[PDB]
Amino acid sequence: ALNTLVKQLSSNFGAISSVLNDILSRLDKVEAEV
Amino acid sequence: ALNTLVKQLSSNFGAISSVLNDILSRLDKVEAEV
Amino acid sequence: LNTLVKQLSSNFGAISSVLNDILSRLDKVEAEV
């Protein structure tokens, strides 16, 4: 159903944001060490 | 309605592509320094 | 909503693939600094 899809999408995008933020923070730290 | 959802999704996916591209670009550069 | 769901599945699969490649590459650089 539509409402279920929308909830799934919010969870997916939330997880993607989390993973991207972790990557960005780690990449910042590596860049600072070169 | 559906049109609103599709526009929101399109915007979300565009932002994710932009961020991924920036990360890939930055990773390429760091890999060259280590 | 079959068409949209199929498109979304494809997009999310591609994102997971790209994220995995990034995480692998990031792990290696962290080990090399």
CSV table of N, CA and C in Angstrom, one decimal:
chain,number,residue,atom,x,y,z
A,1,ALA,N,0.8,-1.2,0.0
A,1,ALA,CA,0.0,0.0,0.0
A,1,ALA,C,0.9,1.3,0.0
A,2,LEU,N,0.2,2.4,-0.4
A,2,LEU,CA,0.9,3.6,-0.6
A,2,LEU,C,1.6,4.1,0.7
A,3,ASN,N,0.8,4.1,1.8
A,3,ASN,CA,1.3,4.6,3.1
A,3,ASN,C,2.6,3.8,3.5
A,4,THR,N,2.5,2.5,3.3
A,4,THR,CA,3.7,1.6,3.6
A,4,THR,C,4.9,2.0,2.8
A,5,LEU,N,4.7,2.2,1.5
A,5,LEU,CA,5.8,2.6,0.6
A,5,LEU,C,6.4,3.9,1.1
A,6,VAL,N,5.6,4.9,1.4
A,6,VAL,CA,6.1,6.2,1.9
A,6,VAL,C,7.0,6.0,3.2
A,7,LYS,N,6.5,5.1,4.1
A,7,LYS,CA,7.3,4.8,5.3
A,7,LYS,C,8.6,4.1,5.0
A,8,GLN,N,8.6,3.2,4.0
A,8,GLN,CA,9.8,2.5,3.6
A,8,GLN,C,10.7,3.5,3.0
A,9,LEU,N,10.2,4.4,2.2
A,9,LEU,CA,11.1,5.4,1.5
A,9,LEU,C,11.8,6.3,2.6
A,10,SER,N,11.0,6.8,3.6
A,10,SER,CA,11.6,7.6,4.6
A,10,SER,C,12.7,6.9,5.4
A,11,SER,N,12.5,5.6,5.6
A,11,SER,CA,13.5,4.8,6.3
A,11,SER,C,14.8,4.6,5.5
A,12,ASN,N,14.6,4.4,4.2
A,12,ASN,CA,15.7,4.2,3.3
A,12,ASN,C,16.5,5.5,3.2
A,13,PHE,N,15.8,6.6,3.0
A,13,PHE,CA,16.6,7.9,2.9
A,13,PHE,C,17.3,8.3,4.2
A,14,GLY,N,16.6,7.9,5.3
A,14,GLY,CA,17.3,8.2,6.6
A,14,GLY,C,18.6,7.4,6.7
A,15,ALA,N,18.6,6.2,6.2
A,15,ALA,CA,19.7,5.3,6.4
A,15,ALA,C,20.8,5.8,5.4
A,16,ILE,N,20.4,6.2,4.2
A,16,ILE,CA,21.4,6.8,3.3
A,16,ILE,C,22.0,8.1,3.8
A,17,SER,N,21.2,8.9,4.5
A,17,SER,CA,21.8,10.1,5.1
A,17,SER,C,22.8,9.8,6.2
A,18,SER,N,22.5,8.8,7.0
A,18,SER,CA,23.4,8.4,8.1
A,18,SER,C,24.7,7.9,7.5
A,19,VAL,N,24.6,7.0,6.4
A,19,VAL,CA,25.8,6.4,5.8
A,19,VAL,C,26.6,7.5,5.2
A,20,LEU,N,26.0,8.4,4.4
A,20,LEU,CA,26.7,9.5,3.8
A,20,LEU,C,27.4,10.4,4.8
A,21,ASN,N,26.7,10.7,5.9
A,21,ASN,CA,27.4,11.6,6.9
A,21,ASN,C,28.6,10.9,7.5
A,22,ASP,N,28.5,9.6,7.7
A,22,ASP,CA,29.6,8.9,8.3
A,22,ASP,C,30.8,8.9,7.3
A,23,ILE,N,30.5,8.6,6.0
A,23,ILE,CA,31.5,8.7,5.0
A,23,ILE,C,32.2,10.1,4.9
A,24,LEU,N,31.3,11.2,4.9
A,24,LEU,CA,31.8,12.5,4.8
A,24,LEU,C,32.8,12.9,6.0
A,25,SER,N,32.4,12.4,7.2
A,25,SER,CA,33.2,12.7,8.4
A,25,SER,C,34.6,12.0,8.3
A,26,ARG,N,34.5,10.8,7.9
A,26,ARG,CA,35.7,9.9,7.7
A,26,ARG,C,36.6,10.5,6.6
A,27,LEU,N,36.0,10.9,5.6
A,27,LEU,CA,36.8,11.5,4.4
A,27,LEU,C,37.4,12.8,4.8
A,28,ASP,N,36.7,13.6,5.6
A,28,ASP,CA,37.3,14.8,6.1
A,28,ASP,C,38.6,14.5,6.9
A,29,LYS,N,38.5,13.5,7.7
A,29,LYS,CA,39.6,13.2,8.6
A,29,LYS,C,40.8,12.6,7.8
A,30,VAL,N,40.6,11.8,6.8
A,30,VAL,CA,41.7,11.3,6.0
A,30,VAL,C,42.3,12.4,5.2
A,31,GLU,N,41.5,13.3,4.6
A,31,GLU,CA,42.0,14.4,3.9
A,31,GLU,C,43.0,15.3,4.7
A,32,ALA,N,42.6,15.4,6.0
A,32,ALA,CA,43.4,16.2,6.9
A,32,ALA,C,44.7,15.6,7.3
A,33,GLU,N,44.9,14.3,7.0
A,33,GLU,CA,46.0,13.5,7.4
A,33,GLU,C,47.1,13.4,6.3
A,34,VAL,N,46.7,13.7,5.1
A,34,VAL,CA,47.6,13.8,4.0
A,34,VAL,C,48.4,15.1,4.0
B,1,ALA,N,-0.4,14.3,-4.0
B,1,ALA,CA,-0.7,13.1,-4.7
B,1,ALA,C,0.6,12.5,-5.3
B,2,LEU,N,0.4,11.6,-6.3
B,2,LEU,CA,1.6,11.0,-6.9
B,2,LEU,C,2.6,11.9,-7.5
B,3,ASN,N,2.1,13.0,-8.1
B,3,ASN,CA,3.0,14.0,-8.7
B,3,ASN,C,3.9,14.6,-7.7
B,4,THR,N,3.4,14.9,-6.5
B,4,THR,CA,4.2,15.5,-5.4
B,4,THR,C,5.2,14.5,-5.0
B,5,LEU,N,4.8,13.2,-4.8
B,5,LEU,CA,5.8,12.2,-4.4
B,5,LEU,C,7.0,12.1,-5.4
B,6,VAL,N,6.6,12.0,-6.7
B,6,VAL,CA,7.6,11.8,-7.7
B,6,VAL,C,8.6,13.0,-7.7
B,7,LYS,N,8.1,14.2,-7.5
B,7,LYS,CA,9.0,15.4,-7.5
B,7,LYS,C,9.9,15.3,-6.3
B,8,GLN,N,9.4,14.9,-5.2
B,8,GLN,CA,10.2,14.8,-4.0
B,8,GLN,C,11.3,13.7,-4.1
B,9,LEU,N,10.9,12.6,-4.7
B,9,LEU,CA,11.9,11.5,-5.0
B,9,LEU,C,12.9,12.0,-5.9
B,10,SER,N,12.5,12.7,-7.0
B,10,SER,CA,13.5,13.2,-8.0
B,10,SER,C,14.5,14.1,-7.3
B,11,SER,N,14.0,14.9,-6.4
B,11,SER,CA,14.9,15.9,-5.8
B,11,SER,C,15.9,15.1,-4.8
B,12,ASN,N,15.3,14.2,-4.1
B,12,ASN,CA,16.2,13.3,-3.2
B,12,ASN,C,17.3,12.6,-4.0
B,13,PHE,N,16.9,12.0,-5.1
B,13,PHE,CA,17.9,11.2,-5.9
B,13,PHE,C,18.9,12.2,-6.5
B,14,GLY,N,18.5,13.4,-6.9
B,14,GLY,CA,19.5,14.3,-7.5
B,14,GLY,C,20.5,14.7,-6.4
B,15,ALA,N,20.1,14.9,-5.2
B,15,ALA,CA,21.0,15.4,-4.1
B,15,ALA,C,21.9,14.2,-3.8
B,16,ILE,N,21.4,13.0,-3.7
B,16,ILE,CA,22.3,11.8,-3.5
B,16,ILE,C,23.3,11.7,-4.6
B,17,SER,N,22.9,11.8,-5.8
B,17,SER,CA,23.9,11.7,-6.9
B,17,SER,C,25.0,12.8,-6.7
B,18,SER,N,24.6,14.0,-6.4
B,18,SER,CA,25.6,15.1,-6.3
B,18,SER,C,26.6,14.8,-5.2
B,19,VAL,N,26.1,14.3,-4.0
B,19,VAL,CA,26.9,14.0,-2.9
B,19,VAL,C,27.9,12.8,-3.2
B,20,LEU,N,27.3,11.8,-3.8
B,20,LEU,CA,28.1,10.6,-4.2
B,20,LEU,C,29.3,11.0,-5.2
B,21,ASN,N,28.9,11.9,-6.1
B,21,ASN,CA,29.9,12.4,-7.1
B,21,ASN,C,31.0,13.1,-6.4
B,22,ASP,N,30.6,14.0,-5.4
B,22,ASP,CA,31.6,14.7,-4.7
B,22,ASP,C,32.5,13.8,-3.9
B,23,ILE,N,31.9,12.8,-3.2
B,23,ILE,CA,32.7,11.8,-2.5
B,23,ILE,C,33.7,11.1,-3.4
B,24,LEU,N,33.2,10.6,-4.6
B,24,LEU,CA,34.0,9.8,-5.4
B,24,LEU,C,35.2,10.6,-5.9
B,25,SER,N,34.9,11.9,-6.2
B,25,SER,CA,36.0,12.8,-6.7
B,25,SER,C,37.0,13.0,-5.7
B,26,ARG,N,36.6,13.2,-4.4
B,26,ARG,CA,37.5,13.4,-3.3
B,26,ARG,C,38.3,12.1,-2.9
B,27,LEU,N,37.7,11.0,-3.0
B,27,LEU,CA,38.3,9.7,-2.8
B,27,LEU,C,39.4,9.5,-3.9
B,28,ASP,N,39.1,9.8,-5.1
B,28,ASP,CA,40.1,9.7,-6.2
B,28,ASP,C,41.4,10.5,-5.8
B,29,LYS,N,41.2,11.7,-5.3
B,29,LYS,CA,42.3,12.5,-5.0
B,29,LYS,C,43.1,12.0,-3.8
B,30,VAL,N,42.4,11.6,-2.8
B,30,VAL,CA,43.2,11.0,-1.6
B,30,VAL,C,43.9,9.8,-1.9
B,31,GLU,N,43.4,8.9,-2.8
B,31,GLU,CA,44.0,7.7,-3.2
B,31,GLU,C,45.4,7.9,-3.9
B,32,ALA,N,45.5,9.1,-4.5
B,32,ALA,CA,46.7,9.5,-5.2
B,32,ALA,C,47.8,10.0,-4.3
B,33,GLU,N,47.4,10.3,-3.1
B,33,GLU,CA,48.3,10.9,-2.1
B,33,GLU,C,48.8,9.9,-1.1
B,34,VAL,N,48.2,8.7,-1.1
B,34,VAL,CA,48.7,7.6,-0.2
B,34,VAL,C,49.2,6.4,-0.9
C,1,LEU,N,1.1,0.6,-8.6
C,1,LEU,CA,2.3,1.5,-8.6
C,1,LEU,C,3.6,0.7,-8.9
C,2,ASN,N,3.4,-0.4,-9.7
C,2,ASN,CA,4.4,-1.3,-10.1
C,2,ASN,C,5.6,-0.7,-10.7
C,3,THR,N,5.3,0.3,-11.7
C,3,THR,CA,6.4,0.9,-12.4
C,3,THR,C,7.3,1.7,-11.5
C,4,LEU,N,6.7,2.5,-10.6
C,4,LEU,CA,7.5,3.4,-9.7
C,4,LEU,C,8.3,2.5,-8.8
C,5,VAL,N,7.7,1.5,-8.2
C,5,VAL,CA,8.4,0.6,-7.3
C,5,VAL,C,9.6,0.0,-7.9
C,6,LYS,N,9.4,-0.4,-9.2
C,6,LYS,CA,10.5,-1.1,-9.9
C,6,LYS,C,11.7,-0.1,-10.1
C,7,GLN,N,11.3,1.2,-10.4
C,7,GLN,CA,12.3,2.2,-10.6
C,7,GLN,C,13.0,2.5,-9.3
C,8,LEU,N,12.3,2.6,-8.2
C,8,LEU,CA,12.9,2.9,-6.9
C,8,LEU,C,13.8,1.7,-6.5
C,9,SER,N,13.4,0.5,-6.7
C,9,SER,CA,14.3,-0.7,-6.4
C,9,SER,C,15.6,-0.6,-7.1
C,10,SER,N,15.5,-0.2,-8.4
C,10,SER,CA,16.7,-0.1,-9.2
C,10,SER,C,17.6,1.0,-8.7
C,11,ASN,N,17.0,2.2,-8.3
C,11,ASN,CA,17.8,3.3,-7.8
C,11,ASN,C,18.5,2.9,-6.5
C,12,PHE,N,17.7,2.3,-5.6
C,12,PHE,CA,18.3,2.0,-4.3
C,12,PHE,C,19.4,0.9,-4.4
C,13,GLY,N,19.2,-0.1,-5.3
C,13,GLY,CA,20.2,-1.1,-5.6
C,13,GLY,C,21.5,-0.4,-6.1
C,14,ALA,N,21.4,0.6,-7.0
C,14,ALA,CA,22.6,1.3,-7.5
C,14,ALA,C,23.3,2.1,-6.4
C,15,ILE,N,22.5,2.8,-5.5
C,15,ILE,CA,23.0,3.5,-4.4
C,15,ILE,C,23.8,2.6,-3.4
C,16,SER,N,23.2,1.4,-3.1
C,16,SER,CA,23.9,0.5,-2.2
C,16,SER,C,25.2,0.0,-2.8
C,17,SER,N,25.2,-0.3,-4.1
C,17,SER,CA,26.4,-0.7,-4.8
C,17,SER,C,27.5,0.4,-4.7
C,18,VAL,N,27.2,1.6,-5.0
C,18,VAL,CA,28.1,2.7,-5.0
C,18,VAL,C,28.6,3.0,-3.5
C,19,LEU,N,27.7,3.0,-2.6
C,19,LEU,CA,28.1,3.1,-1.1
C,19,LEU,C,29.1,2.0,-0.7
C,20,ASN,N,28.8,0.8,-1.1
C,20,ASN,CA,29.7,-0.3,-0.7
C,20,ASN,C,31.1,-0.1,-1.3
C,21,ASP,N,31.2,0.3,-2.6
C,21,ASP,CA,32.5,0.6,-3.2
C,21,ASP,C,33.2,1.7,-2.5
C,22,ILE,N,32.4,2.8,-2.1
C,22,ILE,CA,33.1,3.9,-1.4
C,22,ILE,C,33.6,3.4,0.0
C,23,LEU,N,32.8,2.6,0.7
C,23,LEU,CA,33.2,2.2,2.0
C,23,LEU,C,34.4,1.3,2.0
C,24,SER,N,34.5,0.5,1.0
C,24,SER,CA,35.7,-0.4,0.8
C,24,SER,C,36.9,0.4,0.5
C,25,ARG,N,36.8,1.4,-0.4
C,25,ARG,CA,37.9,2.3,-0.7
C,25,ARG,C,38.3,3.2,0.4
C,26,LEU,N,37.3,3.6,1.2
C,26,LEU,CA,37.6,4.5,2.4
C,26,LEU,C,38.4,3.7,3.4
C,27,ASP,N,37.9,2.4,3.7
C,27,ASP,CA,38.6,1.5,4.6
C,27,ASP,C,40.1,1.4,4.2
C,28,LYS,N,40.4,1.2,2.9
C,28,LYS,CA,41.8,1.1,2.5
C,28,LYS,C,42.6,2.4,2.7
C,29,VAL,N,42.0,3.5,2.3
C,29,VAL,CA,42.8,4.8,2.5
C,29,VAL,C,43.0,5.0,4.0
C,30,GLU,N,42.1,4.7,4.8
C,30,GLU,CA,42.3,5.0,6.3
C,30,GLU,C,43.5,4.1,6.8
C,31,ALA,N,43.6,2.9,6.2
C,31,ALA,CA,44.7,2.1,6.5
C,31,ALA,C,46.1,2.5,6.0
C,32,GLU,N,46.0,3.4,5.0
C,32,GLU,CA,47.2,3.8,4.3
C,32,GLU,C,47.8,5.2,4.7
C,33,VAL,N,47.0,6.0,5.4
C,33,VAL,CA,47.5,7.3,5.9
C,33,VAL,C,48.5,7.2,7.1
